[PDB]
Amino acid sequence: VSPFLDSTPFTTLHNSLYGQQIHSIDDELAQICKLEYELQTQIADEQITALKHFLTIRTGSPQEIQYVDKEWMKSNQHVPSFLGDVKLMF
Amino acid sequence: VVMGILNGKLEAPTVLERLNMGFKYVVMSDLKQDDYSPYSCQGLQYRRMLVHWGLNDSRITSFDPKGKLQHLLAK
């Protein structure tokens, strides 16, 4: 199921629109975007695991992942409202 | 850049897509499907594109805004 295989080339889009009929150009582009979205998802699925293994080897073995999407940003945080827009003056 | 993901910053829509550009009534047909190209090292599909339209020439009419304004400035 791993994408990193020669059998799976990023070139599975050439023989797509060769023969069949095409309609108003709004939905084939959406189909391509959806397919690339799927490809990116299965790419990241093992990219994260590879990063976890690399970090575990590089540092202390115990490593745990946690999804930090916007719903979590509500969790404890720090705010230097003043020093908020970090910049260099002078 | 870290503070952007820490805070609610980023994630906003761009400004390019606000302007509405597009075409209507587009006519579409099959590519040539022959592979003779002087660049034999490249992929098969790129060769098919090249034969249909031919080799590019004059390197100026093609926009490439990196060099078009440089050529204008030189002239």
């Binding site: 108003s24 709004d26 939905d27 | 597009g22 006519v27 579409m28 047909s29």
Partner: peptide
Amino acid sequence: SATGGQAIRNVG
């Protein structure tokens, strides 16, 4: 839906 696209039927 927004960009109309036509094609040749069988002269291709």
